[PDB]
Structure 1
Amino acid sequence: RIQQRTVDEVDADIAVLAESRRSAQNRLEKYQQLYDEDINHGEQRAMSL
């Protein structure tokens, strides 16, 4: 029984790390979109005028 509980514990830790991964990749792709778009048309207009 005790070892059943321990394998349960490690499975829970797997889930914890998995949702950690989801959060990290969210931050990543948000940064990536924010970086690729670089400078939008508003600042282009500011500099041009």
Structure 2
Amino acid sequence: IRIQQRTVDEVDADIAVLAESRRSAQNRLEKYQQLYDEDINHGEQRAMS
């Protein structure tokens, strides 16, 4: 019973691992979205003009 309690500790440690995986991956997601949707900025259109 103690062994399988430790196993439950293993699996919920893994799900915490994946929760902070979500944190990092979503951070990447908003960074890339902000880069893409802003695209080209007023300095670059000024250079082009």
After TM superposition, give the deviation of residue 43 of structure 1 in Å.
0.5
After TM superposition, give the deviation of residue 23 of structure 1 in Å.
0.4
Normalising by structure 1, we get a TM-score of 0.93
Determine the C-alpha separation between the residues in 1 that align with 2:48 and 2:9.
Answer: 59
Normalising by structure 2, we get a TM-score of 0.93
Aligned alpha-carbon RMSD (Å)? 0.5
SS of residue matched to 1:39: coil
Which segments of structure 1 move beyond 4 Å, counting only runs of 4 or more?
none
Unaligned stretches of 5+ residues in structure 1: none
After TM superposition, give the deviation of residue 2 of structure 1 in Å.
0.6
After TM superposition, give the deviation of residue 33 of structure 1 in Å.
0.5
After TM superposition, give the deviation of residue 42 of structure 1 in Å.
0.3
Amino-acid identity (%): 100
Unaligned stretches of 5+ residues in structure 2: none
* Matched length: 48
Determine the C-alpha separation between the residues in 2 that align with 1:16 and 1:31.
Answer: 23
